[PDB]
Structure 1
């Protein structure tokens, strides 16, 4: 609950930076994933670089109970309920001949039960294949390549990678016969015909307002066994842009949505979608004050290596999400937000904006 809230809150702020820079385009992100990999990165840092990450994340990984709570949290998400629905991997890749500080690798293993991977970036082609093969095998083949590693070269010394895949099984699947093409209204006033699923049920529903008073619908769709849920949020009026909701998101608001829901009979019409995003985390993390880690002489990675100059050459997140089939109407025929939440802990696992299914 506590680290899940810290992780979720920080990751939702990174998502807002990504969505604000990517207006009118589809975006899928993992708040949990960016928090998990940055929590690991905290152990490699010192001085102002460490202070900037800790101030942005709101916690210190070395504080008593934090690393055990994140380990416990990771176990709860990899539990028996997960029927090849969620796949996640975090990896820190460092140059092989780089003199590491004594005590770094055993301390990293003590807290994370994993290692920082050592690769020879001088063998550029091979370093690129290793990173891709690491992501492929730890996502059960669902994410097989990162395009951002096309910038990996002989000078690269430190790469941060996070990859996640999600395709959940609904508690109540959408009937296959009810799916048909409907007009979706894009934010630029144009229309596109897309396959839209339909289901008549008692849905957890609530209505909230933006600070300017615009109403927006929030619907909850549980996955099998009620561990995970998908939240769908969209403004009632087509003239209200989706950014009005995205600009006010937080881990606290999502909990408040769930808390205020009541089960109501509705015909829900929802577009099918399959989305993939690969995002360079540099600009969103700099906007949240983590500037030093990406600068050659400012970056302080002395807890990892106190011999040579180190900086993060590349920080990437790659996410793939699939949404398919397995009375007053609610038609989601305009851009909308989605949130995948682990309800027992409150972890925001996925977040996205669907501008065009």
Structure 2
């Protein structure tokens, strides 16, 4: 509830910075994931660096209830109870021969039930592979090469990574016997021919206006388990750019969508998509106030090391999502549109993305 909203709202704001910077390119992101690893980060920071993170996220991780809330949240989401195909990894790596604050590790581990890993970034390629293998093996082998070539070097002292793979199955899946190349109309007027799925069913649907007055469709594709949903949304009119919608998104608005949904017999035309995005969190986080964490001597990580100056050399998220098959009105998404994977009991925005070109 409370912390699920803070986390989601925060993550949706990060998504927006990412979106406003790749205005015409495919993006998949995880609001929840970036909130999770920046909450971890809070434990390692101090002074103004810590205050920046806290002012942007809306809560302090060491307040009572805060951390236990987040763990209960994690167990609510990643519950093999749901037979869920979410695989997730968070991880902070720090240079090996720096004296860590006594008492930090046991504390970090009690709160998050994971640990900060120590490696030697002086073996540049060996350390890149240790981190990559760690991410790969902890995402069911789905997320490879998170750290690209030259992403780390001898001076690298602290690296933050977040990786997610999601392959849910729609409660009511699209029948393959109904997929066909259709004209998809891109943000720059030019069109292209992509395969679009289609299905006539009793879909949850509603429509909203932007603060500007532009109309848009929202539709909810529930997943097996009755717990997660994908929402698909796009301005009805093609001359209105998807950004008019992305710019007004929030975790609350998304809750209102769900709240207004009604079950209506509809024809849905929806392009298949396979997205894999690596997002460099630096610029987006910087745009939200968190600037110090990236500056060599101004960054305060004195909760992690009281003696040696640390700064974040890389903060990276890599996400992968595959959306495939497993007198009604028509909703045709032959334009750029948004998607959101939502955990409805808590209101957590797990995934969010835009398809500008499938």
Superposition TM-score, scaled by structure 2 size: 0.98
Q: Which residue of the partner structure matches residue 341 of structure 1? A: 342
Contact between 1:81 and 1:225, CA under 8 Å: does it hold in 2? no
Task: Quote the offset at 1:150 in angstroms.
Answer: 2.7
Residues 15-38 of structure 1: per-residue CA shift (max 9 Å, x gap): 000000001100110000000000
Take 1:148 and 1:60, find their aligned partners in 2: how far apart are those partners? 32
Give 1:2-13 correspondences, 5 Å limit: 2-13=2-13
Task: Quote the offset at 1:80 in angstroms.
Answer: 2.6
Residues 69-103 of structure 1: per-residue CA shift (max 9 Å, x gap): 10111111111344352111000000011110101
Task: Quote the offset at 1:148 in angstroms.
Answer: 4.1
Contact between 2:276 and 2:319, CA under 8 Å: does it hold in 1? yes
Take 1:269 and 1:220, find their aligned partners in 2: how far apart are those partners? 13
Take 2:18 and 2:82, find their aligned partners in 1: how far apart are those partners? 28
Residues 134-176 of structure 1: per-residue CA shift (max 9 Å, x gap): 1101101011221446320111000000000011111011111
Take 1:89 and 1:156, find their aligned partners in 2: how far apart are those partners? 21
Q: CA RMSD in A?
A: 0.9
What secondary structure, in the 3-state scheme, does the structure 2 residue paired with 1:43 have? helix
Task: Quote the offset at 1:339 in angstroms.
Answer: 0.3
Q: Does 1:272 align with 2:272?
A: yes
Residues 316 and 181 of structure 1, relative CA distance in 2, 3 Å threshold: same
Take 1:149 and 1:20, find their aligned partners in 2: how far apart are those partners? 27
What secondary structure, in the 3-state scheme, does the structure 2 residue paired with 1:64 have? coil
Q: Which residue of the partner structure matches residue 106 of structure 1? A: 106
What secondary structure, in the 3-state scheme, does the structure 2 residue paired with 1:173 have? coil
Contact between 1:101 and 1:306, CA under 8 Å: does it hold in 2? yes
What secondary structure, in the 3-state scheme, does the structure 2 residue paired with 1:149 have? coil
Give 1:230-245 correspondences, 5 Å limit: 230-245=230-245
Superposition TM-score, scaled by structure 1 size: 0.99
Structure 2 unpaired stretches of 5+: none
What secondary structure, in the 3-state scheme, does the structure 1 residue paired with 2:203 have? strand
Q: Which residue of the partner structure matches residue 127 of structure 2? A: 127
What secondary structure, in the 3-state scheme, does the structure 2 residue paired with 1:276 have? strand
What secondary structure, in the 3-state scheme, does the structure 2 residue paired with 1:239 have? coil
Take 2:299 and 2:56, find their aligned partners in 1: how far apart are those partners? 16
Contact between 2:32 and 2:350, CA under 8 Å: does it hold in 1? yes
Task: Quote the offset at 1:129 in angstroms.
Answer: 0.3
Task: Quote the offset at 1:211 in angstroms.
Answer: 1.3
Contact between 2:208 and 2:215, CA under 8 Å: does it hold in 1? yes
Take 1:154 and 1:195, find their aligned partners in 2: how far apart are those partners? 46
Q: Does 1:88 align with 2:75?
A: no
What secondary structure, in the 3-state scheme, does the structure 2 residue paired with 1:225 have? coil
Task: Quote the offset at 1:225 in angstroms.
Answer: 1.9
What secondary structure, in the 3-state scheme, does the structure 2 residue paired with 1:187 have? coil
Take 2:318 and 2:80, find their aligned partners in 1: how far apart are those partners? 25
The count of corresponding residues between Structure 1 and Structure 2 is 357
Contact between 1:81 and 1:227, CA under 8 Å: does it hold in 2? no
Contact between 2:78 and 2:84, CA under 8 Å: does it hold in 1? no
Q: Which residue of the partner structure matches residue 184 of structure 1? A: 184
Take 2:35 and 2:148, find their aligned partners in 1: how far apart are those partners? 20
Task: Quote the offset at 1:10 in angstroms.
Answer: 0.2
Contact between 1:148 and 1:316, CA under 8 Å: does it hold in 2? no
Take 1:40 and 1:54, find their aligned partners in 2: how far apart are those partners? 12
What secondary structure, in the 3-state scheme, does the structure 2 residue paired with 1:213 have? coil
